Amino acid sequence: GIQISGKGFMPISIIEGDQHIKVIAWLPGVNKEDIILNAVGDTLEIRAKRSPLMITESERIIYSEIPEEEEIYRTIKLPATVKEENASAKFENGVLSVILPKAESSIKKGINIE
């Protein structure tokens, strides 16, 4: 079971590994400093901010599809415990990538048939 929520538009992808869990989050226009990272147990919290659609006074906006909200965040519920002390995060081109090593108790054991 997993649940995620937050404000604004933020494409996200999550991948599971036999020893870790990986997360990808699109954060265009956000610096690593503006990104706030908090992970513990089986949950993850991310908050971010960006400058608004500021323009020169003499200029005018004639077309806009980019969302203009500054503050954005996402809170994530993991399906199993992970070692936040051993997790790592990386930011690349308006995108954040995180690796979540699985907790020792969270790693299942193989079972045979007959």
Distance, CA of 114 to CA of 96 (rounded, Å)? 45
Candidate list 58, 69, 70, 101; residue touching a copy of itself; CB under 8 A: 58
Q: Is the CB of residue 72 less than 8 Å from the CB of residue 48?
A: yes
Rounded to a whole number of angstroms, the minimum distance from the CB of residue 98 to a copy of itself is 7
For the bound state, the minimum distance from the C-beta of residue 71 to a copy of itself, rounded and expressed in Å, comes to: 8
CA nearest to 82, candidates 40, 38, 24, 22: 40
Are the beta carbons of 69 and 8 closer than 8 angstroms? yes
Query: Does residue 69 touch a copy of itself according to CB under 8 A?
Result: no
Q: Is 28 in the site for a copy of itself (CB under 8 A)?
A: yes
30 interacts with a copy of itself by CB under 8 A: yes
